[PDB]
């Protein structure tokens, strides 16, 4: 596809295709949970809910409109979609929703039963969802008294304390034109969306964000949550790794794909070409893992997430899964890194050529707001074929070879041993 | 599993000085018979060089 | 051999076989789930170990997924690497191995897997029930395996020869050339199957009303009811179930799903009502059968049905229901009624 | 641990062969028969080694009817050779039974670990 | 305080309490279960191992039963040592300790075997399913404790403040002078319990007709129907089970089992039908409901029933029926119908 | 090993005499504060040895919400060593919360198991 | 468990010359290992006392 942006006081970004029969409109704010502080954490997560509350869905339902809004720690966003033919009725809605009156939503009676909603969300979240809130751990260490440790549903503590003059306060300061861009996907042309912005003379607030005292920064820490009374062990743990606007944005994105994601009851899976897979599969160590490398406006994680009932071999696993880290400092071969460029050509390609707008609403108001363009699917499929053997080696002997690790976990974890018996694993020393 | 823990005469190196559970708040104290050890082996070592000149 | 295909300008291809082979068409309880599991397995050929390395370095990946209807062999990859993939799922039809340690080591594993997680949701399990009262031999036929059955390995051989036949499968593309397409699909082994016979019936089936069941189960409890629907009667009942989902209605805060299951010779609507407290499931399915006995008007929620439909129905051939122009109303006649946990303060059929 | 695949690649190139098959083979039967296994109770396909991966998949892969039957004729000869004698002349194993039963087994393993060695360790066409 | 006994020539003597207490009036889903496995253990002041090694040494042992109506204390010891055991199932009655360490160590361990080795018999599971549907809240209620709804240390404790009253129980004896009885009960802790109210309730039980119910169970197959019993109809009845049983009938190498329970307001008649084969079990239900429709003569089966229910009644206070006389004949009505097992290959009621 | 039985036999004649228990009781109250249990957060109880079956028993039947506080108040107590410190003054275990928790299941545990034995080597009354 | 199980020492003699399994159909060439084993009790305790003699 293709991309078009414009400036006419509002940056205005579409990517049409007329093979959709849908039609997304919203706005992404350049604002999220990394932009609050520990008093007012979870206000952008009751935004949210009050966007998607019972009495303004109602007045959607009644054009043919449905609603959608998300909450990460870079950006915010509140989309519209509709048929085709009907994109001019979805911009309407979203005028007097946030240019103008969203003090018909902030009465009394629609504050307290939101709010209630909101509490019993993160209360059923911290019991009984368990990958999801030790991910959520292991940026509270990290990057702890940074902005990037908040987490972005918020607290149960925090949460009790919000009243509608923060709700109102945190508006004025963060849903500026300076800080937004409009967004159109699906069937919808470029033009046909700028020229009915122009037709109503449209300001959401002026501009000058704050200035964010501190950046991100990463130390070497470790939390432990455990709980006896659960029946597995959920563990993560990364090192420092890559922002976007980096250069080694794909090569740290193509080592992950080299160990990749793992089902112990998924036939296929257990044939995989990992050598990891060779020691897992003896004593069946664990049942499930992941390997990530997420990427931030200030920095980023790179790692794995398991989860395993074998609470007994629990330094087995973290043991072998450190020493195959290594390989791509001293020996990783060039069929691996063949391997990993194909799949993650159609990893990047399902997320970015999926069929819903409003996934393809969120990743380019993103990029925009983050370096004031979109660079193409065949532009970021050139540089990773350009990946070699000695690009890897000398990402991983900067980024991996004996350097500090952050650690999170939850349940049986009593087999999980101490914090310098797995840094050391992090550098061979039989070398 | 690892070789140390595999291997019948590692192992019990690996169960006796590597992997072995121990309480966080002992003392120095604790430390007097490792020593007694390292006296044992002191005096056989020189003993035996001493016996080659011995009548 | 009906073959169709969609092009468009992106990187990813993808393509699928459909077979009508699913559980309304079982010779036995669960076989269909058993040839589901065995496909990608060992062919006469080429092993199981050697697909997924090959395509890993082509940049694909198979699945094979089974419903009461089709049973469909999926490829998503690169679009220039078509012929290698069309070849691919067309030795599957063909030659496949059928060993006896591939059962006992691979297959059958994987099979009580799929069970295993299913009996600890009572919302599945309520499903189930609902479709075994209202037809009770064809659609009403348990979709996964429990072992209640025994089903050998020449039982799963021999349904294979029954479902995989020139005259009861579809290919479909999605961002495929289709002059390509019909030309690789006629210098293959598609081509070479045996021209069989299609397994659909035109007829409508035959369904029950006015039954009840009840299971005890420990967790939370639920409340379902459902209602067969033929042909004519469709949209009505898509609306229906996207009015009382929606911000429209009032029931919305007391019901946890609600809708329209789609056959090519009608369908079957359900609402479920869950919670752990077995006063409050009883005192909202109580309120529900009570407004819906009364009646709605459902003209209000005919737009907001055509979007909703229109998302479902991105990259799926497209059954198609112009019909929401003359929906007005709706009133409640006629139910079946399930009831699964703390069945002794669960209310009764005979009461709401 | 000479493989099986390469014992059989040689023997099939002597059978079908007209010269060598007439000076091996009824060498090969004397050697059977002096071997004498076949008097404990005992067929072939029982004296093979079984403290290795490939042969520990074949034994799981055999049909319960025929592991049954291994079972004793390995019990029963344990028991003859502890008393010092032989069985009867009518209880000893006949050339016919002398089957290898556990061969085809055996093959398929080798095989599979070979084509999994030759993928862990391959170089690309680039 | 109804005392009863009977005297005679012998050794041993037997001494029952048999109170008002059974599963048909559980506040709670199996609280007569765990009540019922509690007796027996530590009063206030005897400990459970000092009442078994003491008792051991005079020679007797003690027990208790459940049923749906009655929940059954009962001694077996020799005759000399009578006023021993009348003061022991008193203390029982009046001064247990309910302490929480004896659930968790004894009784809860001790209901889950009974549930284990009765979720195995299929034929114990449509017993109980054919008293659900025929009676829905009194008699139908589960017998055993399975965990579906919670039951706590205090609600074992009001129940038995609710069964265990004076106007509640019935004390009886067999091979026991009454004159010594009547004695050693007024000088017991048994006339000092609380004066309350008998459970006992002279309306009919309401009931239900045309019901039906499916099960899957991996095992055997069977195929049970009841019927539902008032009082003047018992005799007829009671011949039926005997008949059908006996080598008067050529149904009786089809039925693996009849019976009719008895209550102080009617019963309830069961049929049994059981193999292994799900065939087998079809055409011999079949075969069975056609028959009983078109109709039995009952007359050549009035004296052997006779012998049969004197047989039962040899030591039980004996619920009286002279009404053999007048049974000659008997058609089948409604009823209601059971299948569990491999339910896709067993009838329906409709087609019975 | 002297059991608790006996303890409390000796202590209950102390305290229900009027001239013992007041030259016994203010010597008992400053030999607890010199012994410095309380300022690494310890109650009494704590610190009873339990590599027996008495006191095996004695700890399951305790309710989980004082077990769980329990093993809360002993890590925090192994942690305060390792570091040659005492905790703030604020967080010492104060002579009101210095209660007898695991007494009475101590006493139950110790009359049941004499109980027993006196049953197992009994002699009849004949 | 009986005492020659749940002993720490007696539990290797136990596992060793007691209770250990063995093939039916060894021959006595598998008992010239105990006699190496008397052989070197003897070589060593007659050593002691010779020593004692020695110059
Ligand atoms: C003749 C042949 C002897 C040869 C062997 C010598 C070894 C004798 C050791 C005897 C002993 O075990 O006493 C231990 C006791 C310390 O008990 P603790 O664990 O609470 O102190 C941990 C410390 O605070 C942390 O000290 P840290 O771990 O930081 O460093 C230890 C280092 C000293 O560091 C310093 O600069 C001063 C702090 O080195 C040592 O301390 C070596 C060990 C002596 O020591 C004391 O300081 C107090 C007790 C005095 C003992 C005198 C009576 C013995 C005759
Ligand atoms: C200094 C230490 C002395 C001991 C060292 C030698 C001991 C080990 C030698 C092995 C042996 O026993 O010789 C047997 C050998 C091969 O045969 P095989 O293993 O199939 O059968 C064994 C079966 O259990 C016998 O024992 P069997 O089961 O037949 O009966 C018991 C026998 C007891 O005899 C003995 O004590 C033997 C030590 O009953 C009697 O003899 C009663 C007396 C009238 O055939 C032979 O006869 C070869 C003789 C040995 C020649 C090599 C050494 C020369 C340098
Ligand atoms: C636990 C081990 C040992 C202890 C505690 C020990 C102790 C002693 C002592 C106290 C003396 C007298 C020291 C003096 O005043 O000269 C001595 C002498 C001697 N010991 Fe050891 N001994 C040990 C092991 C051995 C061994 C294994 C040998 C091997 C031959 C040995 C050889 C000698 C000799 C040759 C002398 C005489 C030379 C001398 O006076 O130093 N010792 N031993
Ligand atoms: C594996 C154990 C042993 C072996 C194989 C062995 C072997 C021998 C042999 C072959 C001789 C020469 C015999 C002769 O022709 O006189 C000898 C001499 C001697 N050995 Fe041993 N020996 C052993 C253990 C010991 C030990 C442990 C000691 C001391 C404690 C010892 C003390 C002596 C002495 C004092 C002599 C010289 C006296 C003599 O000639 O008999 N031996 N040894
Ligand atoms: C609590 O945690 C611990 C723990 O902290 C420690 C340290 C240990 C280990 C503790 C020890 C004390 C180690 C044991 C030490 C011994 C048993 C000493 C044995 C010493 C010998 C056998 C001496 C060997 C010496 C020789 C053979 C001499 C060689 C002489 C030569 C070659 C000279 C050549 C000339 C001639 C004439 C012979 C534990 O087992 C342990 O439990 C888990
Ligand atoms: C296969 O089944 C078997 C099996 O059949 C056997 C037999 C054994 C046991 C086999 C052995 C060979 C036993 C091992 C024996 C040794 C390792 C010998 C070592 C010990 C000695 C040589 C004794 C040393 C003697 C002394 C230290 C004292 C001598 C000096 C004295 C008495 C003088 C004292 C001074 C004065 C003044 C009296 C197995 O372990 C086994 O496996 C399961
Ligand atoms: C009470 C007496 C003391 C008893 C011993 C306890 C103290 C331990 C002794 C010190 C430990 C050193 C052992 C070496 C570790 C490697 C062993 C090994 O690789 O096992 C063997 C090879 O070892 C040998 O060749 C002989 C060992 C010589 C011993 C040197 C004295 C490898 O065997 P593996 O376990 O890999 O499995 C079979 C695969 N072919």
Redesign the pocket.
């Known amino acids: 596809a293709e991309v078009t942006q414009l400036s006419n006081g509002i940056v205005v970004a579409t990517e049409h295709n007329p093979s959709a029969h849908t039609a997304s409109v919203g706005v992404v704010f350049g604002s999220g949970a990394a932009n609050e502080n520990p008093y007012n954490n979870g206000v952008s997560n009751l935004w949210k809910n009050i966007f998607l509350s019972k009495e303004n869905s109602a007045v959607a339902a009644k054009e043919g409109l449905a609603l959608s809004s998300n909450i990460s720690r870079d950006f915010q966003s509140y989309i519209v979609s509709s048929l085709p033919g009907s994109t001019d009725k979805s911009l309407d809605f979203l005028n007097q929703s946030f240019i103008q009156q969203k003090a018909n939503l902030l009465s009394s009676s629609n504050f307290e039963a939101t709010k209630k909603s909101v509490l019993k969300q993160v209360q059923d979240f911290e019991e009984n969802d368990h990958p999801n809130r030790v991910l959520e751990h292991l940026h509270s260490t990290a990057f702890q008294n940074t902005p990037l440790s908040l987490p972005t549903r918020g607290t149960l503590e925090s949460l009790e304390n919000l009243v509608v003059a923060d709700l109102e306060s945190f508006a004025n300061n963060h849903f500026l034109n300076s800080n937004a861009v409009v967004v159109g996907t699906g069937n919808i042309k470029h033009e046909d969306l700028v020229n009915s912005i122009e037709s109503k003379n449209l300001s959401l607030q002026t501009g000058t964000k704050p200035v964010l005292k501190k950046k991100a920064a990463f130390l070497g820490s470790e939390v432990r949550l455990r709980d006896d009374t659960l029946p597995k062990a959920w563990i993560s743990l990364a090192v420092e790794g890559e922002p976007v606007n980096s250069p080694n944005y794909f090569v740290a994105k193509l080592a992950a794909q080299i160990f990749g994601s793992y089902n112990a009851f998924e036939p296929a899976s257990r044939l995989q070409g990992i050598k990891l897979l060779d020691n897992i599969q003896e004593y069946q160590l664990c049942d499930n893992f992941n390997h990530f490398s997420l990427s931030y406006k200030d920095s980023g994680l790179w790692g794995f997430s398991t989860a395993t009932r074998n609470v007994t071999m629990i330094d087995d696993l973290i043991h072998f899964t450190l020493k195959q880290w290594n390989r791509l400092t001293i020996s990783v071969t060039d069929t691996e890194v063949e391997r990993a460029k194909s799949l993650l050509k159609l990893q990047l390609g399902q997320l970015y050529e999926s069929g819903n707008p409003v996934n393809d609403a969120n990743l380019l108001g993103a990029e925009v707001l983050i370096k004031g363009s979109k660079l193409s699917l065949g532009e970021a499929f050139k540089k990773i074929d350009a990946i070699t053997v000695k690009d890897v080696k000398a990402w991983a002997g900067k980024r991996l070879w004996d350097q500090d690790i952050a650690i999170a976990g939850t349940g049986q974890i009593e087999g999980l041993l101490d914090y310098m018996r797995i840094r050391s694993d992090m550098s061979m020393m039989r070398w | 599993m690892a070789f140390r823990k595999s291997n019948v005469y590692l192992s019990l190196v690996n169960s006796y000085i590597i992997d072995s559970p121990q309480p966080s708040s002992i003392?120095?104290?604790?430390?007097?018979g490792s020593?007694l050890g390292l006296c044992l082996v002191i005096q056989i070592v020189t003993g035996i060089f001493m016996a080659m000149h011995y009548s | 051999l009906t073959v169709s295909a969609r092009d468009a300008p992106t990187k990813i291809s993808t393509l699928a076989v459909k077979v009508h082979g699913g559980s309304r068409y079982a010779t036995k309880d669960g076989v269909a789930h058993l040839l589901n599991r065995f496909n990608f397995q060992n062919t006469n050929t080429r092993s199981a170990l050697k697909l997924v390395r090959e395509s890993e370095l082509l940049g694909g990946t198979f699945k094979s997924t089974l419903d009461r209807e089709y049973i469909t062999l999926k490829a998503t990859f690169l679009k220039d690497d078509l012929p290698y993939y069309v070849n691919a799922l067309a030795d599957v039809l063909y030659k496949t191995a059928f060993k006896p340690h591939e059962l006992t080591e691979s297959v059958l594993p994987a099979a009580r897997y799929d069970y295993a997680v299913a009996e600890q949701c009572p919302v599945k399990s309520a499903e189930d029930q609902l479709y075994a009262i209202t037809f009770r031999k064809g659609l009403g036929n348990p979709l996964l395996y429990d072992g209640v059955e025994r089903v050998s390995l020449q039982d799963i051989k021999d349904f294979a020869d029954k479902v995989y036949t020139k005259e009861n499968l579809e290919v479909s593309g999605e961002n495929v050339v289709e002059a390509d397409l019909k030309r690789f699909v006629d210098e293959s082994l598609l081509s070479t199957l045996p021209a069989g016979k299609s397994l659909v019936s035109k007829s409508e089936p035959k369904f029950f009303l006015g039954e009840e069941n009840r299971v005890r189960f420990i967790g939370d409890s639920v409340a379902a009811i459902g209602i067969p629907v033929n042909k004519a009667s469709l949209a009505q009942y898509e609306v229906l179930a996207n009015y009382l989902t929606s911000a429209l209605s009032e029931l919305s805060g007391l019901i946890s799903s609600a809708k329209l299951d789609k056959f090519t010779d009608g369908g079957l609507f359900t609402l479920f009502v869950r919670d752990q407290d077995s006063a409050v499931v009883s005192s909202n399915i109580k309120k529900i059968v009570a407004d819906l006995k009364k009646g709605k008007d459902l003209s209000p929620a005919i737009n907001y049905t055509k979007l909703k439909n229109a998302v479902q129905n991105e990259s799926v051939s497209s059954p198609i229901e112009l019909n929401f122009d003359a929906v007005k109303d709706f009133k409640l006649g006629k139910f079946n009624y399930v009831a699964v946990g703390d069945v002794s303060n669960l209310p009764y059929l005979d009461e709401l | 641990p000479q493989s099986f695949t390469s014992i059989a690649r040689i023997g099939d190139y002597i059978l079908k062969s007209p010269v060598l098959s007439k000076l091996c083979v009824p060498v090969a039967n004397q050697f059977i028969n002096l071997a004498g296994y076949k008097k404990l109770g005992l067929k072939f396909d029982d004296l093979i080694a079984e403290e290795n991966p490939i042969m520990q998949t074949a034994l799981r892969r055999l049909p319960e009817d025929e592991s049954y039957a291994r079972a004793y004729r390995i019990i029963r000869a344990h028991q003859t050779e502890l008393t010092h004698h032989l069985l009867p002349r009518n209880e000893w194993i006949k050339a016919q039974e002398d089957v290898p039963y556990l061969l085809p087994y055996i093959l398929e393993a080798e095989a599979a670990a070979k084509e999994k060695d030759e993928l862990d360790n391959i170089e690309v066409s680039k």
Request: overall charge neutral.
């Open positions: 003392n120095y104290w604790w430390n007097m020593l």
